[PDB]
């Protein structure tokens, strides 16, 4: 009896205030494209995942559903009668019995905010009402003989988007929330389609909703639909990466600084798999630092596990565990064991490391490191030599890299220059590889080019800041 | 005697860490494991050494009698708290903490320290008991008590008694305050050595000045170093006392090199052979080698390495492989030429390094500004 | 000892004599200003996050 009533209060009041203020903002002002309660949906990314998972069988949350699905609200007297009915639909939990809507009363409850003479002028209340059945069901994480019910509720949510496409779409811009809803549902729905085979019908309606946007509206929905396309495009990533790069989808722009990070991660892996490493490293580092708000959120453990993989494919050697965290130090242990081998030149120990932990490397989604990595087993070494010796000979490099034949030792140099690892040139009168130095970085108009972009971005921050201001 | 109780850690680390290669030092620790130590860890060495025989007999026999001597003034306070002063007087454990923290084992002596922390609010005895607790943390290499209570020792009791208690907060050097980072904090605390006469702690003030002159090499190259170690009366006095360490200093200050390498080997003879080798002195030897190569390589634009070999010692190919490691490590900025035996140095002018630093710092600041802009206003 | 502002040349026996670079004092103050501004924006992030 102490566990029930306080969730019954705070988890009545947060969403009562959210629904009331969302309807009041979306109708009182027409400029509610980015309302205050939009951040409330950000709270719903983090609230209900730790607030309640099951319907709280000690008479707490099972009564929240039939009250919040009984909404008629014709005018002010019907809404006031709903406020009067709130006391009884509140006390029915704590006094007698919360009704057992045990994982099934979500399908005939679609017409429940149409029963008892309901009018639907606020579409986002129906969007939140279609968002609610995933709270005791897909946020309970069971996935046992239950899949068809979330697919049915998602078809009802699709019918809600058809209602947003056909029934009174007079500049409501509710899709700017609904696509965010089509974020969260179609996350775990994706997990459902992760459990079964390829999501071809999801591919078709994802493309259809991707081109349903842009011409209609464009704010943070097309980015989410693009990313939800591209993740399972990258699942069976066979030849569609050329399609994804020729997919003109750099549009995203504002993405609350979180979705843009994983979009950068996805296109970084696409560009990393196609031998272009130097362009991949900068966008990998950009995606790593874009949203590091919390430590080891799963995303960091994977972008950090791709980052110095592509950096070791480039040739530069950082140590991996320099951000020792609760789930960084012990999760990157064979990662550190592999990155210790590239500084050395032992191939047998590296092969023993790979054969010892090849199952974990296949678990990381990084099958194809080895098919290129042996090239860097020589290449990194010669760049270190090209960093150490400004003028190296032709015969000393044979014993400085244990490359046996002097012609074989002097042939990697005939590739590393051409793709570009070292400025040095070779001449066949001495057999000496020698490089020059750069002094003109500050002497020429190199700093002005970077400074113009920095100045433009910094001064435009002031304009964007002042453009959102005082609202008396 | 909690102030002479650091004999426990001192001789227990004088044997127990080099006990893998200490023969006579086992016999040295034999008449101090039984005769004067805290408690049951006098057994503990049988997990490393032989089974032990005789210490089971006497050490229990005194200790229960000492527990029979632990009635002491407790019962005398029970017949002496009849006076209604403070419902207490300075007779009992508050004046009996010397046994229970000297002879008490840390699993119970930590609770004894907490018991005598429930005590008078006088700052002097409180600061003394905190220094006793810091030494008790250094007894068993706990590495958590010497982290937690040092903040209490330095900051929390910093309301009085200063400018003369500060020569007892010098334990924050070699302790969890100053780990193997033998650098600016540790050398700054060690350079506040305005004293000659002994104050226990590490024993044998010559060892303190050798520790200070060892941390001075990793402290500074020569920004005003000649005043702080070379031109000082007491440090030159103990340098007159200790000849080989004076040779180690003057083979670097006079820039003689060569024999400096020999002194490094002599330093190796006590780099790991002391007690404090459970962390490695590799970040000292490599740092000294890089420091010596930096002071040689300065004022020589095009130096042949044949001169460098005779300047530092032997090992032309050793010089080559050492520079090949150290240049590509990132430090010691020069560009060795394998042919023509020239080691040419390049140094960045002070407009390009400043440009790179401004670009990097401005990049992280603009990223932070854009993140803060995205936090508010959606 | 920073008494003389030149650099020797060892194996050629040449004493290179040259001056010292002046100015480069704006950039140091700029770098310290940017670090101090990082402290300022840290405090601003704290103020913004406390009351949302």
């Amino acid at each position: 009896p102490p566990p029930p009533p306080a969730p019954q209060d705070v988890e009545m009041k947060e969403e009562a205030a959210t629904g009331g203020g969302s309807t009041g903002e979306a109708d009182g002002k027409t400029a509610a494209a980015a309302a205050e309660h939009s951040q409330r949906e950000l709270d719903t990314v983090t609230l209900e995942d730790i607030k309640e998972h099951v319907k709280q069988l000690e008479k707490a949350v099972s009564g929240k559903e039939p009250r919040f699905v009984l909404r008629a609200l014709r005018m002010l007297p019907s809404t006031s009668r709903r406020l009067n009915h709130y006391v009884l639909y509140k006390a029915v939990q704590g006094f007698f019995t919360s009704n057992n809507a045990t994982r099934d009363f979500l399908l005939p409850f679609l017409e429940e905010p149409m029963d008892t003479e309901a009018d639907l002028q606020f579409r986002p209340r129906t969007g939140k009402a279609a968002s609610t059945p995933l709270l005791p069901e897909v946020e309970a994480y069971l996935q046992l003989l239950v899949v068809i019910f979330m697919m049915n509720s998602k078809r009802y949510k699709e019918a809600q988007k058809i209602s947003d496409d056909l029934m009174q779409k007079i500049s409501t811009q509710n899709r700017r929330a609904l696509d965010l809803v089509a974020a969260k549902c179609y996350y775990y729905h994706a997990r459902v389609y992760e459990f079964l085979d390829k999501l071809d019908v999801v591919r078709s309606f994802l493309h259809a909703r991707l081109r349903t946007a842009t011409l209609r509206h464009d704010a943070d929905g097309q980015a989410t639909l693009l990313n939800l396309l591209l993740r399972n495009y990258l699942h069976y990533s066979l030849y569609d990466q050329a399609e994804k790069l020729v997919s003109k989808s750099v549009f995203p722009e504002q993405a609350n600084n979180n979705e843009w990070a994983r979009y950068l991660y996805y296109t970084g892996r696409i560009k990393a798999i196609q031998l272009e490493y130097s362009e991949a490293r900068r966008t990998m580092t950009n995606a790593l630092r874009k949203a590091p708000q919390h430590t080891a959120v799963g995303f960091k453990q994977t972008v950090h596990k791709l980052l110095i993989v592509v950096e070791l494919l480039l040739g530069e050697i950082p140590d991996r565990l320099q951000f020792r965290q609760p789930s960084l130090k012990r999760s990157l242990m064979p990662y550190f064991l592999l990155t210790q081998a590239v500084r050395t030149g032992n191939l047998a120990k590296f092969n023993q490391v790979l054969d010892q932990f090849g199952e974990k490397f296949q678990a990381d989604g990084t099958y194809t490191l080895i098919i290129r990595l042996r090239h860097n087993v020589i290449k990194t070494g010669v760049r270190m030599i090209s960093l150490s010796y400004s003028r190296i000979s032709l015969a000393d490099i044979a014993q400085k890299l244990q490359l046996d034949s002097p012609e074989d030792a002097e042939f990697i140099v005939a590739k590393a220059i051409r793709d570009g690892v070292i400025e040095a040139s070779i001449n066949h009168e001495k057999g000496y590889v020698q490089s020059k130095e750069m002094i003109d970085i500050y002497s020429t108009r190199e700093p002005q080019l970077a400074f113009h972009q920095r100045i433009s971005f910094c001064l435009d921050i002031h304009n964007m800041s002042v453009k959102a201001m005082r609202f008396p | 005697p909690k102030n002479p109780d650091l004999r426990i850690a001192q001789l227990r680390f004088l044997l127990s860490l080099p006990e893998h290669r200490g023969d006579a030092a086992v016999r040295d620790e034999l008449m101090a494991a039984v005769r004067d130590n805290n408690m049951a860890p006098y057994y503990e060495a049988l997990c490393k050494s032989l089974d032990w025989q005789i210490d089971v007999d006497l050490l229990n026999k005194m200790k229960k009698a000492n527990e029979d001597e632990l009635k002491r003034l407790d019962e005398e306070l029970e017949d002496a708290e009849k006076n209604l002063g403070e419902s207490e007087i300075r007779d009992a454990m508050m004046a009996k903490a010397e046994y229970l923290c000297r002879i008490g084992d840390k699993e119970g002596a930590l609770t004894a320290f907490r018991k005598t922390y429930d005590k008078t609010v006088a700052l002097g005895h409180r600061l003394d008991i905190v220094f006793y607790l810091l030494r008790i943390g250094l007894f068993y290499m706990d590495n958590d008590l010497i982290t937690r209570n040092t903040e209490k020792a330095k900051s929390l009791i910093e309301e009085g008694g200063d400018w003369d208690r500060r020569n007892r907060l010098k334990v924050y050097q070699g302790l969890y305050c100053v780990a193997i980072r033998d650098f600016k904090q540790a050398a700054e605390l060690f350079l506040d050595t305005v004293s000659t006469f002994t104050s226990y702690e590490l024993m044998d003030y010559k060892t303190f000045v050798t520790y200070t002159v060892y941390v001075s090499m990793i402290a500074l190259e020569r920004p005003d170093l000649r005043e702080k170690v070379i031109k000082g009366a007491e440090i030159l006095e103990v340098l007159h006392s200790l000849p080989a360490v004076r040779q180690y200093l003057f083979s670097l200050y006079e820039c003689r090199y060569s024999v400096f390498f020999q002194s490094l080997a002599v330093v190796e003879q006590e780099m790991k052979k002391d007690w404090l080798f459970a962390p490695h002195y590799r970040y000292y030897v490599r740092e000294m080698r890089i420091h010596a190569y930096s002071q040689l390589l300065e004022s020589y634009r095009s130096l042949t390495l044949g001169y460098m070999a005779e300047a530092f010692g032997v090992g032309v190919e050793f010089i080559d492989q050492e520079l090949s490691r150290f240049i590509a490590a990132g430090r010691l900025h020069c560009k060795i030429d394998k042919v023509n035996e020239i080691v040419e140095t390049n140094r960045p002018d002070s407009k390009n390094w400043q440009y790179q630093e401004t670009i990097k710092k401005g990049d992280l600041l603009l990223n932070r500004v854009q993140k803060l802009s995205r936090v508010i206003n959606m | 000892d920073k008494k003389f502002h030149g650099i020797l040349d060892q194996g050629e026996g040449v004493l290179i004599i040259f001056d010292e670079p002046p100015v480069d004092k704006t950039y140091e103050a700029a770098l310290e200003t940017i670090q101090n501004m990082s402290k300022v924006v840290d405090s601003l992030y704290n103020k913004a996050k406390k009351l949302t």
Binding site: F451, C458, S465 | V369 | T33, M37, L44, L51
Partner: peptide, 30 residues
Amino acid sequence: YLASLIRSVVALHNLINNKIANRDAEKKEG
């Protein structure tokens, strides 16, 4: 460039000051 950088954080300070002192005031007033 440093002038633009020293201007932007002042603009951001004014923005978050206005937003906090507005939202708390409308929390009181409503």
